[PDB]
Paper text:
The [name] motif interlocks with [name] in an arrangement reminiscent of a paperclip: [name] α-helices α4L and α5L and [name] α1H pack against a β-sheet formed by insertion of β1H from [name] between [name] β-strands, β18L and β21L. To identify residues essential for the interaction of the SLPL and SLPH subunits, we analyzed H/L complex formation in an enzyme-linked immunosorbent assay (ELISA) with a panel of individual point mutants. Mutations of a single amino acid within [name] (F274A) or [name] (Y27A) in SlpACD630 were sufficient to destabilise the H/L complex. Loss of SLPL also resulted in partial degradation of SLPH: N-terminal sequencing revealed truncation of the [name], indicating that this region is unstable in the absence of the [name]/[name] interaction.
The surfaces of most bacteria and archaea are covered with a proteinaceous coat, the surface or S-layer, which is formed through the self-assembly of individual protein subunits into a regularly spaced, two-dimensional array. In [name], the S-layer largely consists of a major [name], [name], which assembles into a paracrystalline array enveloping the cell. The major protein of the [name] S-layer, [name], is post-translationally cleaved into two S-layer proteins (SLPs): the high molecular weight ([name]) and low molecular weight ([name]), herein referred to as SLPH and SLPL, respectively. These subunits then form a complex (referred to as H/L) that is incorporated in the S-layer.
Numbering used by the authors:
A (entry chain B): 9 to 47
B (entry chain A): 245 to 313
């Protein structure tokens, strides 16, 4: 099903950190695709 | 049918960023735009529809592209 994900924190710093981690891992998993071509 | 998931980073139990990324493929442009909006609000007070104070917490909303393989 379609999904809507709401991420919440009282402090902007904590929200920033979660999103920063998400960004890192989302990019890493997407890079695995390219690695399969490289290797 | 549709799924709404709330991730309360201030709570005693929430899905890790690692596990969220394992579960879903996100459009990187969506995530980057939200991250930059958070930074702009924090650093320069720039308000955006992307990062709002709602019911006592700042929030962003993501619409995953897919379920990760």
């Amino acid at each position: 099903s379609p999904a809507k994900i709401t991420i919440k924190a009282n402090k902007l710093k904590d929200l920033k950190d979660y999103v920063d981690d998400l960004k890192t891992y989302n990019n890493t998993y997407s890079n695995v695709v390219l690695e399969h071509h490289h290797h | 049918s549709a799924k709404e998931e709330s991730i309360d980073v201030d709570s005693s139990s929430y899905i890790s960023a690692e596990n969220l990324a394992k579960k879903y493929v996100f459009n990187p442009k969506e995530v980057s735009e939200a991250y930059n909006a958070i930074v702009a609000l924090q650093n320069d007070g720039i308000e955006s529809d992307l990062v709002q104070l709602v019911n006592g917490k700042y929030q962003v909303i993501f619409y995953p592209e897919g379920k990760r393989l």
